[PDB]
Design a protein around this nucleic acid. Structure first.
Ligand SMILES: [Mg+2]
Ligand SMILES: [Mg+2]
Ligand SMILES: [Mg+2]
Ligand SMILES: [Mg+2]
Ligand SMILES: [Mg+2]
Ligand SMILES: [Mg+2]
Ligand SMILES: [Mg+2]
Ligand SMILES: [Mg+2]
Ligand SMILES: [Mg+2]
Ligand SMILES: [Mg+2]
Ligand SMILES: [Mg+2]
Ligand SMILES: [Mg+2]
Ligand SMILES: [Mg+2]
Ligand SMILES: [Mg+2]
Ligand SMILES: [Mg+2]
Ligand SMILES: [Mg+2]
Ligand SMILES: [Mg+2]
Ligand SMILES: [Mg+2]
Ligand SMILES: [Mg+2]
Ligand SMILES: [Mg+2]
Ligand SMILES: [Mg+2]
Ligand SMILES: [Mg+2]
Ligand SMILES: [Mg+2]
Ligand SMILES: [Mg+2]
Ligand SMILES: [Mg+2]
Ligand SMILES: [Mg+2]
Ligand SMILES: [Mg+2]
Ligand SMILES: [Mg+2]
Ligand SMILES: [Mg+2]
Ligand SMILES: [Mg+2]
Ligand SMILES: [Mg+2]
Ligand SMILES: [Mg+2]
Ligand SMILES: [Mg+2]
Ligand SMILES: [Mg+2]
Ligand SMILES: [Mg+2]
Lengths: 394, 131, 63
RNA sequence: AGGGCGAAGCCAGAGGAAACUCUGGUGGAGGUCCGUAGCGGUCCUGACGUGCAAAUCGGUCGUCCGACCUGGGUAUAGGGG
RNA sequence: UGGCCAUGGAAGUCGGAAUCCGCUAAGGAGUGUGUAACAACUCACCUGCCGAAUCAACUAGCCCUGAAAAUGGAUGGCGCU
RNA sequence: CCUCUGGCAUGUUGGAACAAUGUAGGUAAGGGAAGUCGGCAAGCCGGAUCCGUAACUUCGGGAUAAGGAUUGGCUCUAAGG
RNA sequence: GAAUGGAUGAACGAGAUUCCCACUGUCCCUACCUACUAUCCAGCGAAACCACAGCCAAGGGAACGGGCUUGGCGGAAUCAG
RNA sequence: CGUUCAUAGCGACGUCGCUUUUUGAUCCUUCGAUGUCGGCUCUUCCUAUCAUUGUGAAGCAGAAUUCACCAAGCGUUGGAUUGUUCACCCACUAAUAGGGAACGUGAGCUGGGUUUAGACCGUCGUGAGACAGGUUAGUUUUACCCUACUGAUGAUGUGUUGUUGCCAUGGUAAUCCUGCUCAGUACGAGAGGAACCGCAGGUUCAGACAUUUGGUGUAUGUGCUUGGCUGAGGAGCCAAUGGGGCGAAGCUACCAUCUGUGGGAUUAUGACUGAACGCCUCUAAGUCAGAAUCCCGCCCAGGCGGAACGAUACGGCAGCGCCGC
RNA sequence: UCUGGGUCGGGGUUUCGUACGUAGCAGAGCAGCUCCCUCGCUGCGAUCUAUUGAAAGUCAGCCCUCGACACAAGGGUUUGU
């Protein structure tokens, strides 16, 4: 018989094999369509989820009840120290797909990057790209290099730069810097390639990719939760108290007579550590890192035009389970995928953004900087020292 | 013009919020919440500012033994305002009302939540304190 | 962003944090955290409780 | 075990013209109540269900001075007890 | 020619018995529209133009409509004009 | 419930982890039986002292009816041989 | 329907119902924690069951096939569920 | 019948069908047993479409509407009584459409009901006993095998190894509503009373997350407190987590917060040019618009499928890469 | 050898709510002795004040140290165009 009282089914099939993702670094499954017209640029970046916090802002959507009313708002800090371009890699269209065609690597490559290429660095002699870099200083090699670049000019269509992180500049344990292919979207391929050939071995900061009040897509791996039962992993009803063989289950897997259990039926398995591409996360603040002209410039982070203090986005006692954000960072609206410390791919949108909400200009009023390691009540240490007065530790 | 925003709604069907207008009713047995499509097994729930059908369980015998519309005015379940302040109220409370939003009483004992005030003007007019 | 003061302890309450209570008498209290609010609801006279501002004013601490 | 209720009888005081009646005690009745050991075995339709167990376990329960519980001895044997 | 029956109004026109003559080139005592009822409109006979076939009613062949079921599916399959 | 006398080595094993399902315990915002055949299960209540105690009644009961208040520590007082 | 007993009825009931107050994760709606498991390891080590075996759709067929026909298809050895 | 008018909507007397969500026939299968109702829970299909998209119809002025077409994408709820299926009532709603899957689903539960044994009542029986007549009490076993599904190591290949990648094939997702505006406007004698574009939000669903609010809390963190025990103080411990305040981190909740997208082919339909048929016709050759559909996109997984690039065993015995013969 | 990661220490953060000791003319009262002084002195005495936002914990999965201490090319199995 039919099921009596209808109800929409639990969980989406558009997300499954609900298995542990192969990758850790979230792949960009599609870069935006390079119109050939606008100038060249990078489409993606690779940051790190340092931590959350508040903002306060005046909102300007006329019509709303909240028009010209200061709301608060959660935000993620994605610490994003500049990447280093160490390669380009040409692709060519085929009817089979999109074959990689030619990879030209830079001359010098950091041990940050070289780390990646060995499973055990302690034990290696660190001999990678050793016979490669010989090419970059002779007649023969330099000529072959030029012919490779020329061939890419003749044949290739898509060009991706290879860059990698500056694992050096982070509070993370790891030294093995994440590489990633990032796509150069812009003018003609010959122009496109000579841009990336100029950028080779060079820094690239965040502000060169992204701008403020820009919708971007966060790509990463979800905070993993191990083996989980069907009630956790699918949010199935619990069965009642009296159930004899347990109650965090599904009762009827399936009907008798497709005499197999279907792929659509809810089973217990891996919950979390899935790959996920959340879209439309507006950049409220691209924040300038600590720098030196005479003394430190720690202010330039979490100070606003209306606050004017001497904060950084770092709260008291740091971001928890992370560190100090001593580098440039972006500040997205809302939560994003994954854990603290997780490497996170940003990506420019796939989508022509023209909604009132997606063109809204964000002027921040106040960044909360109170500790997250307990219930914080002081924004800065100087404020605390004022409020408390002197302590026995003096 | 400007619409409501959702708020943590802690009056499922089965609550007896106290009538906070001068009718003569004391309680308001919420038998249903107006404008709820709802899902299997799920109780219809009315926060503050929500319309509601309401039997009176104790009070005058004019009102007893029939259904009236009503509005929830305070509620003990702490909702979050858009300015990031949570707010709760010490008591759940409402007012007997007609279809078109007018009170059938005349004066509201206690404060009304401004989520209810902005959305219900005739309630707001008879409300002494707001928020 | 009008920073308010905790009706128990005395500390300031920055926009994000804490909770707002609206008693039926028709007066409101702000609580920094639950710790304050619990002492308030259990009727603890904050001048008796050391860590509050009201106590330390009463006992002339600092200065 | 330990508690509760407090029946007859008894004392004093007060009233009553008498009949006798009230008030305060004392007294300690009962297949009386709570409740241990004991005896039992309600519900969880709990645990267990190739068990610890060919009927057990846990909590929860009924009863707990009486048609009470219980050892040993002794009587009744198969269309019979 | 408000023809007759029918008045509730049918002078062609809810219905029904009738149902012919004149002028005629020719128009039914009327196919309908519509009217309380008319009116007004609409539906032969003949021309003017154009330039050889035209049109009706049956009938039977293929094809199509008629033709709605639950795991995904079976001219055996692939396919086939 | 904790202790001495006396007695044991955790009831036929150890180690490392701390997933899902369980078995046995707990806690939960707002609502309060909307759950379910059914308040099943758990929760409320609980001791004592002081008040206060209904209908009904076989006048014995009902009755711990219900419903209330108090309770610690410390320093004293008075009363009982 | 009147000792095949009728009508009653205080007290009593692990007896059968219904409502109210209280109380609660029964539920809205699920969540977190603890212990013993389950898990991995050393040692030890059973049983039921067993024609052969073990991916499907449809067909026909003793009228619901793992095996047959026609199609889809098929990749060692395993772990927790 | 529908004032008039067979056919907007209907439809007698007759007639032709489909359907197996009714009940009968029947007895082919199973009696060395295929667990016998309902509810819960979960998935999937069908359409005979209640709503939602796109449209033709009216006895469609508007509003409300019934009739029909494409169409099953997405929905179709909360309760009172009843073991119920069914039924009815209240309430909300956009709508509270209908079914199938061994009348889906008991090694998934439950066991209220049927349907053993204990008992009561009525009627029947001389009686033992009977009763699709009522009542109450009554044991719901096993998975460690194979498959299927879920996740988890691996597998053959590529000389070995690592890299960054492509993408065959699978899956797939968004939903509907309110308010404001249009506007008391069109339309209508009035009564009443729309719509497109905007704007603001919300339902249900999905995917995350913990800044904040809440929950948990054996950090056994820090107080407080009962009974006991170290002669006491101090410091502690025991009472299967002694109890209780508050509680970091961490999990976690529409109980907190964030995000949810674009094309193509066309269907129904309405059209163009235009014969057939000197006219006329959406059609016959030819052309246009066209959708909750379908296919892709995004999104998830990634093939006994490929890719470019790196490094390729100094040695103490080594072993190999090219080249030519 | 971007000299490193680790243990201990130190900051920061944070949880709780002000440790022990000592002092006090604080302290309801009581006592002993006397100078029977009742602010006599000395003792008992919950609690109170001060020292003291004190004490204590704070990665084990919080943040910074570059202070102290050691320890850091080591082992085993592999694989060939
Ligand atoms: Mg259905
Ligand atoms: Mg059971
Ligand atoms: Mg925190
Ligand atoms: Mg339900
Ligand atoms: Mg049992
Ligand atoms: Mg078992
Ligand atoms: Mg044993
Ligand atoms: Mg033990
Ligand atoms: Mg042992
Ligand atoms: Mg033993
Ligand atoms: Mg609760
Ligand atoms: Mg129900
Ligand atoms: Mg119910
Ligand atoms: Mg019970
Ligand atoms: Mg009683
Ligand atoms: Mg009789
Ligand atoms: Mg007689
Ligand atoms: Mg009889
Ligand atoms: Mg078989
Ligand atoms: Mg007629
Ligand atoms: Mg049959
Ligand atoms: Mg079977
Ligand atoms: Mg159809
Ligand atoms: Mg069945
Ligand atoms: Mg089954
Ligand atoms: Mg069973
Ligand atoms: Mg039964
Ligand atoms: Mg029986
Ligand atoms: Mg096992
Ligand atoms: Mg002590
Ligand atoms: Mg014990
Ligand atoms: Mg057409
Ligand atoms: Mg077209
Ligand atoms: Mg189109
Ligand atoms: Mg695809």
């Amino acid at each position: 018989s039919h099921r009596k009282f209808s109800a929409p089914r639990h969980g989406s099939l558009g997300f499954l094999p609900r298995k542990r993702s192969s990758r850790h670094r979230g792949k960009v499954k599609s870069f935006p369509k390079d119109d050939p017209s606008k100038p060249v640029h990078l489409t993606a970046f690779l940051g790190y989820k340092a931590g959350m916090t508040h903002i306060v802002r005046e909102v300007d959507r006329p019509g709303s009840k909240v028009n010209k009313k200061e709301v608060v708002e959660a935000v993620t800090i994605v610490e994003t120290p500049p990447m280093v371009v160490v390669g380009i890699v040409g692709y060519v269209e085929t009817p089979r797909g999109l074959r990689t065609f030619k990879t030209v690597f830079a001359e010098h490559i950091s041990d940050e990057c070289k780390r990646r290429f060995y499973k055990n660095w302690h034990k290696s002699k660190k001999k990678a790209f050793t016979k490669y870099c010989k090419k970059w200083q002779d007649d023969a090699g330099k000529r072959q290099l030029d012919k490779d670049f020329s061939s890419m000019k003749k044949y290739c269509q898509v060009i991706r730069v290879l860059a990698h992180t500056q694992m050096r500049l982070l509070p993370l344990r790891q030294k093995k810097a994440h590489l990633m292919e990032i796509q150069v979207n812009g003018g003609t391929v010959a122009e496109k390639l000579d841009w990336a050939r100029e950028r080779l071995e060079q820094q690239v900061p965040v502000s060169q990719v992204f701008g403020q009040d820009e919708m971007i897509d966060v790509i990463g791996v979800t905070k993993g939760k191990g083996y989980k039962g069907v009630t956790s992993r699918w949010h199935t009803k619990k069965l009642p108290r009296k159930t004899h063989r347990g109650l965090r289950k599904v009762a009827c897997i399936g009907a008798w007579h497709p005499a197999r259990v279907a792929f659509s039926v809810a089973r217990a398995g891996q919950k979390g550590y899935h790959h996920r591409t959340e879209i439309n996360k507006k950049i409220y603040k691209i924040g300038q890192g600590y720098l030196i002209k005479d003394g430190k410039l720690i202010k330039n982070n979490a100070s606003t035009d209306y606050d004017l203090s001497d904060k950084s986005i770092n709260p008291l006692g740091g971001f928890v389970h992370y560190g100090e954000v001593t580098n440039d960072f972006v500040m997205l609206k809302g939560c994003v995928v994954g854990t603290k410390k997780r490497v996170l791919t940003l990506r420019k949108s796939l989508l022509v953004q023209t909604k009132r909400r997606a063109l809204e200009k964000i002027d921040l009023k106040f960044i909360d900087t109170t500790s997250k390691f307990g219930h914080g009540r002081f924004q800065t240490v100087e404020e605390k020292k004022a409020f408390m007065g002197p302590l026995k530790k003096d | 013009s400007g619409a409501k925003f959702r708020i943590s709604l802690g009056l499922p069907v089965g609550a007896v919020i106290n009538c906070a207008d001068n009718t003569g009713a004391k309680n308001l047995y919420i038998i249903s919440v107006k404008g709820i499509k709802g899902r299997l097994n799920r109780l219809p729930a009315a926060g503050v500012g929500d319309m509601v059908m309401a039997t009176v369980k104790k009070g005058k015998p004019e009102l007893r033994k029939k259904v009236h519309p009503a509005v929830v005015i305070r509620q003990r379940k702490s909702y979050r305002r858009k300015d990031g302040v949570f707010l709760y109220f010490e008591d759940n409370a409402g007012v007997i009302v007609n279809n078109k939003g007018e009170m059938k009483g005349s004066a509201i004992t206690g404060p009304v939540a401004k989520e209810c005030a902005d959305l219900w003007p005739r309630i707001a007019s008879n409300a002494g304190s707001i928020a | 962003m009008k920073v308010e003061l905790c009706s128990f302890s005395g500390y300031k309450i920055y926009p994000g944090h804490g909770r707002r209570y609206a008693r039926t008498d028709g007066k409101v209290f702000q609580f920094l955290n639950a710790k304050c609010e619990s002492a308030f609801l259990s009727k603890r006279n904050p001048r008796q409780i050391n860590w509050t501002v009201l106590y330390r004013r009463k006992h002339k601490k600092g200065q």
